[PDB]
Structure formats: C-alpha cells, structure tokens
C-alpha cells in the first residue's frame, strides 16, 4: 500500500486501552488510600505495648525460680528443719 494507511493503524496499535487505564487509575487510588489508612493506624502504636511484662518472654523468672528454690542458699529457714520426716 502507501505510507499513511499503515502508519495510521501502527499508531493505533502503539496507543493503549483507555478503559484499562481508567480502571487501573481508580483501582490504584482505592488501594493506595486503604494502605495509607493502614500506615496511619500503624504509626499510632506506642513504643511500649500495653501487655509488655505480661508477655511470656518478659518474665523469665516465674518459671525459673520454682526449680531453684530447693538449692542451698535460697531455702526458707523452715524447710530443712522438718524435711527429715
């Protein structure tokens, strides 16, 4: 053929779907705003959590001392006296 009859549909192939572009734009806005709200919530967390000491890793002694309160140097004076019988 001639030049323009091919350059026309060439440019038309080069250009994209606008419906896809609009859908992607509204989508991206939706999830970006949702993620923005999520990050805003995340930044509100205090440095020290409400539980803190309640956490099992932050006790480390309520389940260690009971198995140590029997060794010498930690016993209540009234433990060795009546342990004989």
């Amino acid at each position: 053929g001639f030049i323009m009859e091919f350059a026309e549909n060439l440019v038309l192939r080069l250009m994209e779907n606008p419906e896809e572009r609009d859908r992607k734009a509204r989508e991206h806005i939706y999830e970006m705003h949702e993620r923005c709200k999520k990050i805003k919530e995340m930044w509100a967390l205090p440095i020290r959590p409400y539980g803190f000491w309640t956490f099992e890793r932050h006790n480390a002694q309520l389940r260690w001392d009971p198995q140590i309160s029997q060794v010498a140097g930690r016993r209540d004076p009234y433990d060795d006296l009546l342990e004989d019988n």
Binding site: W43, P46, I47, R48, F55, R57
Partner: protein, 244 residues
C-alpha cells in the same frame, strides 16, 4: 593521636555496641521520661558544636572526629523521640554512618602510605588518581547528606522521626546544622578538584583488599536509594523485637 587503624576500629565498632546497650537500658530501665531531656539538650549541643567546629579544622583526622561527633548527635536525635520510628531512624543512621566511616577511613589509610597529614596535601588529587578523587568526593557528599546518595536517607528518616513526636525544634536545629555541615564538606571538595597547588604530593597505589572494600562501599552509597527496602525492614523488625 591514635594510630589510623585504631581510629578506624573506633567510632564504628564501639559506638554500635554502646548504642545497642543504651537502647536496652533506655527502653527498659527508663520509665520516668527523664532521659528525653538529657538526650535532647546534649544531642542539640553535639549537632551545633560539631557543625561549627569541623569547619575550622585543617587536618583530616580532626575533621573525621568532629564529623563523628555530629553524626552521633544526629543519631541521638532518635532517643529523644521514643517511638518505633525513632528507634528505626536511629538504627538506620547508625548503619549508614558505619558504612560511610569505614569508607572514609579506607580513604585515609590509602593516602597514609605517603603520610598524609593536612587537608591541603590532597590537592589536585583528581589528576594523579581521578577515580580515588571521585570516590572521596562521593563519600564526602554522603556525609553531607546530598539527596542522590546514602546518608541523605538516614538524615531524612531521622527528621521524620523527630517531627513524628512533635519535637519541632529538633527538626529546625537538624536542618540548620546540616546546612552548615555541608559547607565545609564542599570546602574539602574545592581543594581536591578545583584549585591546583604549586607542589603536588604523589601517592603510591593501593592494595586489593582496601580497594575492594572501598568499591563495595562506594557502590552501596550511590545505589542505596534504588533498593532500600531490606535495611528498612531489618530495622523495623529490630525496633519491635525490643518488646516482642
């Protein structure tokens, strides 16, 4: 006074461990909120005095010392704002400052082969060894906080943490101290690219280990902003692991 390799080990290895120690003490042993005040004023003073004192120094090691003091103030900004983002900014700043300090001391050790003492001896270094000159200029800019480099990200997120807690005076003093801090860094730049002294000092070539470390750190500094996700995620996990 201390030997160059000793100072290289100092200000990186001790400061990291001491800062982790201070984090452990501050988070747990401090609930009266009275360490905010002691960190606030001292970090402000460190910022101001490092920025105002490093500009008056003519040697290299003194300049690195005062730059270290200034960066210590910048990092200590994170203690005043006690939040997850504050500790994250503090740790990121420590990491970036450690990398930049390693690179800068690699530069200093490289020119130590011919006993570099002052700042004027590294004159016209872009002619004898242009690539080392470029590396040193990039590292100096990273110290300055120029955007297209690492070191700007650390200062950025430190400022973000400072503004998160409402310490608006911390942000302003950080900005002004950065403005003065960049000035003498660029002053270091002029004597090393632009003006050529009459007498030139010739430096013998480097060795492979220092060159490899320097190249790795230089590529880390420039290309950090392209892919900074792993550092941020490490730091966010580390900040939260203090409690859970």
């Amino acid at each position: 006074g201390s030997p160059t390799p000793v100072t290289a080990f100092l200000s990186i290895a001790p400061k990291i461990s001491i800062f982790a120690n201070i984090l452990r003490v501050f988070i747990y042993g401090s609930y009266g909120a009275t360490l905010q005040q002691i960190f606030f004023f001292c970090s402000i003073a460190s910022m101001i005095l490092g920025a105002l004192a490093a500009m008056a120094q003519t040697k290299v090691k003194r300049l690195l010392a005062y730059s270290s003091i200034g960066h210590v103030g910048y990092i200590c900004i994170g203690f005043s704002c006690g939040t997850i983002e504050g500790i994250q900014s503090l740790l990121i700043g420590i990491f970036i400052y450690a990398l930049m300090t390693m690179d800068a001391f690699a530069i200093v050790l490289a020119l130590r082969q011919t006993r570099v003492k002052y700042i004027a001896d590294l004159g016209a270094l872009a002619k004898t060894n242009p690539i080392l000159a470029i590396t040193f200029s990039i590292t100096m800019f990273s110290y300055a906080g120029i955007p297209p480099l690492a070191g700007f990200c650390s200062k950025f997120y430190l400022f973000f943490a400072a503004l998160g807690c409402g310490a608006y005076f911390l942000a302003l003093v950080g900005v002004v101290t950065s403005v003065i801090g960049c000035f003498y860094y660029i002053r270091l730049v002029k004597r090393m690219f632009f003006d050529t002294p009459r007498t030139w000092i010739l430096y013998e070539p480097m060795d492979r280990n220092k060159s490899l470390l320097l190249a790795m750190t230089s590529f880390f500094i420039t290309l950090f902003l392209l892919y900074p996700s792993p550092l941020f995620s490490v730091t966010h996990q580390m900040a939260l692991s203090l409690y859970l």
